[PDB]
Design a protein around this ligand. Structure first.
Ligand SMILES: CCCCCCCCCCCCCCCCCC(=O)OC[C@H](COP(=O)([O-])OCC[N+](C)(C)C)OC(=O)CCCCCCCCCCCCCCCCC
Ligand SMILES: CCCCCCCCCCCCCCCCCC(=O)OC[C@H](COP(=O)([O-])OCC[N+](C)(C)C)OC(=O)CCCCCCCCCCCCCCCCC
Ligand SMILES: CCCCCCCCCCCCCCCCCC(=O)OC[C@H](COP(=O)(O)OCCN)OC(=O)CCCCCCCCCCCCCCCCC
Ligand SMILES: CCCCCCCCCCCCCCCCCC(=O)OC[C@H](COP(=O)(O)OCCN)OC(=O)CCCCCCCCCCCCCCCCC
Ligand SMILES: CCCCCCCCCCCCCCCCCC(=O)OC[C@H](COP(=O)(O)OCCN)OC(=O)CCCCCCCCCCCCCCCCC
Ligand SMILES: CCCCCCCCCCCCCCCCCC(=O)OC[C@H](COP(=O)(O)OCCN)OC(=O)CCCCCCCCCCCCCCCCC
Ligand SMILES: CCCCCCCCCCCCCCCCCC(=O)OC[C@H](COP(=O)(O)OCCN)OC(=O)CCCCCCCCCCCCCCCCC
Ligand code: SF4
Ligand code: SF4
Ligand code: SF4
Lengths: 176, 70, 215, 318, 175, 115, 156, 80, 97
């Protein structure tokens, strides 16, 4: 259940001693390292040509957040506050009130992207599949306050990436 | 692939081809179509000075042949 | 400093170049984790362990999950245990590639870094396929694992584990037989067995000193 | 007219240094399973231009605790010595045909160390002092063995003139009868220019940058082009010493092409060595040349001084 | 004024000697001695001894580099004096340069000077020889005759160097 | 004539590349940028303190050895003399004395570093 | 005017030289430095774009704050940013270097690196992937490209 | 002495090679028969002018013309 | 032998981009001149190509348009200029365009 790494005893005979002396005076293993670098010179490099050649991903990828809708126009969230209660970094702030038709809908839904750790607790604690973690990751901003998403930005992101979010959910909903 | 290191290296080749041959061309221009004569020892310098004095133009590469004598 | 692992302040008293005293000042990355863990629930403090050892994520996840399951008097299903062990060994490959390649980089061999970071990227792709995030997976939870494997992952792991032996062979051809690599490591940092035991050393520090001990 | 000759000598070597930066980056990338710069232009031909224009529009950053006069004099001396020591090399006709060009190159290679030393001492920093003292240790490690190697390999040439070295190798290469001296000379040229695995002065692992850690852009580029011109000159010097090509007095372009491709292969071998080996410790390099190279160099010097007398093969001095 | 090239080089030689003999700090003393060795090898190279000049240049560069390593190691100060940080050093440097240029002005006026010997004012190009030297330089054959003729000199010099190595071993021992 | 012209040309080309690097760009100097760099923290002590060296013995050995091999440099020209046996004997004696001195340094632990 | 065209072309040239020769500094703190090294991996290959790490701040162009900037580290980061020569850019990457991330309410964590150093590009994520960091680097290059230094100097 | 030679060849081959090269370089020129060839090759090289002698009347060994058969010839050097 | 086959493949890569002008355009815009099957084109002008003979990660690529939402994007290409329906296929998240 164990092996004696680096305990081999070197030989003593004249041929092996002459071989070791020849390797000492002629630097054989340095030539071996040179040959390995020369072998790596003639391979196909694994470099992709960004931004024309994106790296492979998965349908389960966690990126920018978005708010979904039912397939009739109604927003999915009913302000149950499970996501802000399960968010470990407290990035989600929710304030709700009954709207004109008496439906339990949000009034403030803020996600601080600089607080968010992108772990998908909100997208897995949502009972109505409202909040999702979309596949977008190219959304870096030049200003700090642009990473403070309110409800309007999240709804616009959902309307922008619904055609991909629906397909990803249809792909991955049977594992949940 | 690997052969794309061959363009830039080739530029290096041009960057190592320009100077030295240029000196040879310079040595073929000032010295009248011959090599620039070397003077490692004082006998060669004395022959250089004798040639410069005997040319009559104060240029040592102006070679005067056997038609000069009677 | 490129030599220090990110944040580390060695105040070193030197006799010219030979070290006479080393004082490692730390705390430049003290985030105060184990108070905010007390200020959060168990599931909320589960992603805290992904960032302690940021090259051994699912190992720390498995440690925290084993502690919570021991306190809860429950056990995970066998398939979850096998998934956890397989991904722990993948994580061990990640950490050991990181250790050997970075150590050779500070010694001076910068080429096996680029040789093995491709395999590191492939294991990160496996992480992303199984959890959705490349490093901080938050995959291993008390009670098993969060989600099952996507189909076709086992074959990709099989192909990668088929070629990784040749990758290790290339690395060992590069570094082990080299005389310059030996001259920096043959008689540097010799630690006896008793001094390793009394200093709280664990893992390879014991196993490099002849002490037969594996958890 | 000599102004034209000296400018056509010194401008293409600067262009060669810049394209050597390009070739170094791209070849070193390709040996590490990746690609070099190819986005700046067509196959990255404009990367050295971007680097050179970028470095000469940045701030110089002269420190307050540094002696400014030596801080300015040291990179000037480095670039100057890198420039006026390319001259005695025959290409196939040298610009300056010195009778004692070998000793001239030895003396000006000994002089170029002082630029590193005064750069380390002038900028008041501990890492710069460590780099300067490591340069001192490297010099006392390599210099005597380098000089004895050159003396032992010049016993077959006849004299110290670099122009007559082509005539010596007109029949056969000088690497055939002096290959141990050739290997020891190659290691000496590697350790002379502070190239890997004997960097030890611009050590980015043990130190941050070494002697040029306080040198910001503008003066920092001077050390870079001095080092790269130095490695090209060592490659050309080794090619002339041990790989003498066929010279036709009517067609010097044949010799120019031959030693150009040979020096290119030698620089490729330099970068081949750079990517594959860990860095030596600077006390192990000190015991490398003084214990392994030096006794063999002394024995080979006695062998090469007793050989031509033994064989009636003493070369002429004219 | 190109005929006085050796005289100008000798002026720079005494200038460097004044520069490092005022003893400001051994770094700048080493720099001054490097400059002095360079112009001295230029002088002797102008007289025809190129080998001797190159040899003394190489030897003194190596010696000054070992010296600089020693002063960085051992002979150092918190605030080294460049040339003007000390009043006495700057003063004696100024009077050394003033005396040198006064001697230059006096010898460049009547072409004669009396400092304890008697010296002319013409350039040294007059004292050269007018004939050639054949196919050899005299200095090269002269130093090459060290082994064919100077056996006693070689023996005593090799013994002195070996004894010097033994002496260096014995002195820096401590017990 | 040509050597000083080449020296002056190279010196001028070197010294022009710093005054171009100085007077061209926009400079902004404050009393925090030009501090000595010690990895983000201010250093302890000065850089002019005594830097205790270890290889002083090998430095003195190099001081002797540089010129003691510079005695061996006219050995090419010494092969052109008529008296050859004496030259060969003296050269072999010189390099033998060099080898004896090196072996005496090696055996007495002189090449090892202090502390 | 011809002078306006001349200063516009010179501004374009210097912006091209500065944006195609970015020299970041080897400076990481945490997880996001591991992702930065994965951006330096052969797959993404930052050295294609002229991006090459430099150890010293005096020979560096940009600084990438990758990790958590704690209270004990902030003077060191400020001095390191101060020692960099102009022009200098800072790319803030990761949630820790943006707004504190997981450790926003911790006692010894600076809530974002904006409080210490001026920031050009904010890269969100935990960690933001090597593709995302390369996208942020390209966005910084685009920001450098549309600089108007010599045009404003001619107008002023 | 075979055991000592094998041990020192296994431990430090560089010193063994250096001592063997040194021993050959010391003891070999005294064995080769070509050292006198070097001697007369070095003595036969005309650095200086061969200043003639006055013909007193009895000098049978020196010639009057360089093409005369009397004198030191170098057909051996042309042959070698 | 196989060298002139490499030369023929290079000449075919030159000819497959619409001639020399298209070759230099795609070289100076994308830094990669390998041809591929035209899988698709969106409403903004971006072209999407696939070549499954290349290794994984290089088998799908996009040539961006020169005009997107009123902006001259001849040189300043962006990774966020891909519509989501093609962003699924480009990032290897599915096998169906
Ligand atoms: C110019 C032409 C090309 C030259 C080669 C260039 C390409 C190859 C480059 C390879 C990579 C080099 C990277 C740097 C390596 C640095 C380390 C290094 O060089 O260490 C040297 C090492 C040093 O050894 P070491 O560092 O292992 O030290 C061993 C120390 N002990 C023993 C105490 C453990 O080897 C040498 O010094 C050998 C020098 C060359 C020897 C040549 C011998 C020729 C044959 C002689 C005769 C033999 C037969 C016996 C006598 C017969 C008589 C008739
Ligand atoms: C060998 C390779 C290098 C070769 C040499 C260099 C090649 C490129 C030479 C031109 C580079 C561009 C001009 C110098 C650099 C300017 C950098 C910069 O941003 O300057 C801003 C400044 C302008 O900024 P400012 O004056 O408004 O100041 C802003 C800063 N405050 C307010 C705090 C003081 O430019 C200049 O000062 C002038 C620059 C040159 C303008 C054109 C001159 C005539 C050219 C014909
Ligand atoms: C010893 C040999 C040394 C060799 C050194 C040089 C090696 C490389 C040689 C050149 C190789 C090709 C370089 C091509 C650069 C890019 C050219 C280009 O496309 O520029 C486009 C750019 C913007 O133009 P835009 O208005 O957008 O175009 C509309 C398009 N529908 O427009 C511009 O940028 C403006 C035009 C720029 C043209 C630059 C041309 C190359 C200059 C290289 C400098 C050195 C030249 C040679 C010097 C030595 C010989 C004299
Ligand atoms: C403050 C810091 C320093 C600032 C200034 C730095 C200036 C540059 C410093 C680096 C260069 C130092 C050069 C030192 C002298 C080198 C001499 C040399 O290169 O000689 C080569 C050659 C010898 O060959 P030879 O055998 O004489 O051939 C004659 C037969 N054809 O010679 C010839 O062929 C003869 C050619 C003419 C020689 C004229 C006489 C010598 C000129 C010396 C100039 C001044 C050198 C000052 C060195 C200062 C070093 C710090
Ligand atoms: C005639 C003989 C004297 C020649 C020089 C006369 C002018 C310069 C000296 C003036 C007197 C100052 C002096 O020498 O002081 C002694 C000084 C060591 O004293 P220190 O420890 O520096 O300070 C304590 C008090 N001075 O020691 C020194 O200053 C030593 C430096 C002397 C440098 C002399 C070389 C310059 C050229 C002299 C002419 C030739
Ligand atoms: C007469 C011949 C010519 C002699 C004069 C010319 C010499 C040319 C070469 C010069 C060499 C200079 C340096 C010599 C140093 C010898 C002393 C020495 O250092 O011995 C130590 C070594 C054992 O190593 P260690 O003690 O560990 O060393 C410390 C760090 N390595 O100890 C050893 O390894 C043992 C060394 C002594 C035994 C060597 C045997 C070599 C045999 C070669 C084949 C036969 C040659 C016959 C000629 C006579 C040889 C004596
Ligand atoms: C009165 C008329 C004259 C007025 C004075 C002005 C004289 C000329 C000044 C220099 C040239 C100005 C124009 C510079 C380029 C402007 C256009 C530009 O920015 O093109 C961008 C293009 C690369 O586009 P990019 O955004 O990188 O594309 C993404 C890739 N997928 O870029 C390219 O394709 C490459 C651009 C190359 C630019 C030319 C080459 C560099 C400069 C060489 C000459 C100067 C330096 C000489 C050598 C100095 C020492 C090394
Ligand atoms: S992904 Fe996690 S950290 Fe981010 S908002 Fe959702 S629950 Fe909070
Ligand atoms: S968990 Fe879902 S339904 Fe509940 S408040 Fe959050 S987004 Fe709305
Ligand atoms: S943002 Fe996340 S990945 Fe980056 S350093 Fe902070 S905890 Fe680690």
């Amino acid at each position: 259940t164990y092996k004696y790494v680096n305990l081999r005893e070197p030989s003593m005979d004249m041929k092996s001693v002459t071989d070791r002396a020849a390797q000492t005076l002629l630097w054989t293993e340095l030539i071996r390292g040179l040959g390995m670098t020369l072998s790596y010179l003639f391979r196909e490099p694994a470099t992709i040509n960004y931004p024309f050649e994106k790296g492979p991903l998965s349908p389960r990828f966690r990126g920018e957040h978005a708010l979904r809708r039912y397939p009739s126009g109604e927003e999915r969230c009913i302000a149950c506050k499970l996501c802000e209660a399960v968010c470990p970094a407290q990035a989600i702030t929710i304030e709700a009130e009954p709207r004109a038709d008496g439906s339990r809908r949000t009034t403030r839904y803020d996600i601080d992207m600089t607080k968010c750790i992108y772990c998908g607790f909100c997208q897995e604690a949502c009972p109505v599949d409202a909040i999702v973690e979309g596949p977008n990751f190219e959304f870096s901003t030049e200003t700090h306050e642009e990473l403070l998403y309110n409800k309007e930005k999240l709804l616009n992101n959902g309307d922008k990436w619904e055609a991909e979010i629906a397909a990803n959910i249809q792909a991955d909903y049977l594992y949940r | 692939m690997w052969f794309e290191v061959l363009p830039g290296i080739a530029v290096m080749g041009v960057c190592l081809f320009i100077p030295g041959m240029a000196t040879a061309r310079i040595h073929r221009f000032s010295n009248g179509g011959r090599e620039k004569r070397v003077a490692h020892y004082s006998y060669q310098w004395y022959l250089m000075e004798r040639d410069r004095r005997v040319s009559g133009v104060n240029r040592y590469y102006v070679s005067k042949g056997l038609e000069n004598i009677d | 400093h490129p030599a220090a692992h990110g944040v580390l302040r060695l105040v070193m008293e030197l006799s010219g170049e030979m070290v006479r005293k080393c004082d490692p000042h730390i705390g430049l990355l003290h985030r105060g984790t184990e108070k905010l863990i007390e200020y959060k629930t168990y599931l909320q403090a589960l992603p805290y362990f992904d960032r302690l050892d940021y090259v051994s994520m699912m190992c720390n996840e498995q440690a925290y999950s084993l502690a919570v399951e021991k306190l809860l008097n429950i056990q995970p299903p066998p398939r979850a245990q096998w998934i956890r062990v397989l991904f722990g060994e993948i994580t061990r490959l990640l950490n050991h590639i990181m250790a050997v390649t970075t150590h050779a980089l500070d010694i001076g061999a910068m080429t096996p870094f680029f040789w093995m970071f491709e395999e590191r990227e492939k294991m990160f792709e496996f992480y992303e396929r199984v959890s959705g995030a490349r490093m901080h997976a938050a995959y291993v939870r008390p009670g098993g694992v969060h989600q099952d494997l996507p189909l076709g992952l086992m074959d990709d792991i099989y192909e990668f584990s088929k070629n990784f032996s040749l990758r290790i062979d290339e690395l060992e051809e590069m570094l082990t037989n080299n005389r310059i690599w030996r001259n920096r490591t043959v008689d540097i940092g010799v630690v006896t067995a008793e001094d390793a035991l009394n200093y709280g050393f664990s893992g390879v520090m014991l196993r490099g000193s002849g002490i037969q001990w594996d958890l | 007219m000599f102004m034209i000759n000296v400018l056509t000598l010194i401008i293409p070597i600067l262009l060669a240094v810049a394209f050597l930066t390009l070739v170094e980056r791209k070849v070193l990338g390709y040996m590490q399973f990746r690609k070099g710069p190819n986005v700046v232009g067509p196959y990255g031909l404009l990367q050295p231009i971007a680097d050179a224009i970028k470095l000469f529009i940045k701030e110089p950053l002269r420190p307050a605790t540094s002696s400014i006069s030596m801080f300015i004099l040291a990179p000037i001396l480095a670039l100057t010595l890198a420039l006026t020591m390319w001259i005695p090399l025959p290409m196939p006709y040298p610009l300056i045909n010195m009778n004692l060009g070998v000793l001239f190159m030895l003396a000006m290679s000994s002089l170029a160390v002082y630029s590193i030393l005064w750069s380390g001492w002038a900028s008041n920093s501990k890492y710069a002092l460590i780099g300067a003292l490591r340069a001192v240790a490297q010099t006392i490690s390599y210099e005597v063995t380098l000089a004895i190697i050159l003396l032992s390999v010049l016993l077959m040439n006849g004299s110290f003139t670099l122009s007559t070295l082509i005539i010596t190798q007109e029949q056969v290469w000088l690497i055939f009868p002096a290959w141990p001296l050739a290997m020891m000379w190659f290691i000496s040229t590697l350790a002379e220019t502070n190239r890997a695995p004997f960097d030890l002065t611009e050590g980015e692992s043990e130190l941050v940058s070494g002697f040029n850690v306080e040198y910001a852009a503008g003066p920092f580029a001077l050390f870079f082009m001095a080092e790269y011109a130095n490695i090209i000159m060592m490659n050309i010097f080794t090619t002339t010493l041990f790989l003498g090509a066929f010279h036709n007095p009517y067609m010097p372009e044949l010799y120019t092409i031959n030693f150009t491709i040979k020096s290119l292969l030698l620089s490729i071998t330099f970068l081949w060595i750079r990517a594959s080996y860990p860095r030596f410790r600077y006390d192990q390099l000190m015991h490398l040349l003084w214990k392994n190279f030096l006794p063999l160099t002394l024995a080979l010097c006695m062998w090469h001084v007793s050989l031509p007398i033994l064989l009636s093969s003493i070369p002429p001095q004219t | 004024m190109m005929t006085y090239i050796v005289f100008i080089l000798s002026i720079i030689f005494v200038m460097g000697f004044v520069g490092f003999s005022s003893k400001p700090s051994p770094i700048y003393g080493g720099l001054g001695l490097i400059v002095s060795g360079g112009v001295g090898c230029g002088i002797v190279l102008n007289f025809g001894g190129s080998f001797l000049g190159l040899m003394v240049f190489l030897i003194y560069l190596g010696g000054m580099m070992v010296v600089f390593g020693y002063t960085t190691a051992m002979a150092t100060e918190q605030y080294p004096e460049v040339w003007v940080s000390n009043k006495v050093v700057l003063g004696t440097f100024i009077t050394g340069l003033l005396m040198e240029f006064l001697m230059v002005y006096y010898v460049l006026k009547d072409k004669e000077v009396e400092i304890v010997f008697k010296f002319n004012g013409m350039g040294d190009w007059v004292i050269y020889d007018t004939g050639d030297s054949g196919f050899f330089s005299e200095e090269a054959m002269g130093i090459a005759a060290l082994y064919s003729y100077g056996t006693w000199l070689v023996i005593v010099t090799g013994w002195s160097l070996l004894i010097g190595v033994v002496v260096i071993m014995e002195i820096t021992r401590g017990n | 004539m040509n050597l000083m012209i080449t020296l002056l040309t190279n010196f001028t080309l070197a010294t022009l590349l710093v005054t171009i690097a100085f007077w061209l760009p926009q400079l902004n100097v404050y009393s925090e940028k030009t501090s000595p760099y010690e990895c983000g923290f201010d250093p302890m002590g000065s850089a002019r303190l005594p830097f205790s060296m270890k290889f002083f013995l090998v430095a003195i050995t190099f001081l002797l050895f540089d010129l003691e091999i510079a005695l061996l440099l006219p050995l090419p020209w010494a092969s052109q003399t008529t008296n050859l046996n004496t030259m060969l004997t003296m050269a072999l004696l010189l390099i033998f004395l060099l080898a004896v001195s090196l072996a005496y340094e090696w055996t007495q632990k002189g090449l090892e570093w202090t502390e | 005017s011809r002078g306006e065209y001349v200063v516009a072309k010179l501004d374009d040239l210097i912006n091209w030289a500065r944006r195609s020769s970015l020299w970041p500094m080897t400076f990481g703190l945490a997880c996001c430095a591991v992702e930065m090294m994965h951006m330096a991996a052969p797959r993404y290959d930052m050295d294609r774009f002229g991006v090459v790490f430099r150890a010293s701040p005096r020979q560096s162009d940009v600084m990438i704050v990758a990790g958590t900037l704690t209270n004990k580290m902030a003077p060191a980061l400020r001095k390191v940013y101060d020692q960099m020569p102009e022009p200098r850019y800072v790319v803030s990457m990761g949630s820790c270097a943006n707004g504190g991330g997981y450790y926003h309410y911790s006692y010894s964590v600076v809530r974002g690196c904006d409080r210490i150093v001026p920031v050009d590009i904010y890269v969100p994520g935990c960690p933001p992937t090597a593709e995302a960091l390369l996208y942020g680097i390209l966005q910084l290059q685009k920001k450098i490209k549309r600089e108007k230094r010599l045009r404003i100097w001619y107008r002023r | 002495v075979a055991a000592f030679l094998k041990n020192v060849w296994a431990k430090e081959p560089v010193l063994v090679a250096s001592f063997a090269i040194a021993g050959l370089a010391v003891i070999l020129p005294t064995l080769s028969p070509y050292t006198k060839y070097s001697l007369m090759i070095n003595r036969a090289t005309p650095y200086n002018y061969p200043v003639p002698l006055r013909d007193d009347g009895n000098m049978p060994d020196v010639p009057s013309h360089p093409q005369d058969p009397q004198g030191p010839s170098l057909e051996w050097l042309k042959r070698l | 032998m196989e060298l002139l086959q490499v030369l023929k493949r290079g000449l075919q890569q030159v000819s497959g981009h619409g001639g020399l002008r298209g070759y230099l355009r795609v070289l100076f815009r994308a830094n990669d001149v390998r041809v591929g099957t035209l899988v698709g084109e969106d409403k903004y002008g971006n072209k999407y190509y696939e070549d499954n003979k290349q290794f994984f990660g290089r088998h799908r690529w996009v040539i961006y348009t020169t005009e997107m939402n009123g902006k001259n994007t001849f040189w300043d290409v962006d990774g966020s200029m891909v519509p989501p329906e093609w962003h699924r296929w480009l990032h290897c998240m599915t096998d169906d365009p």
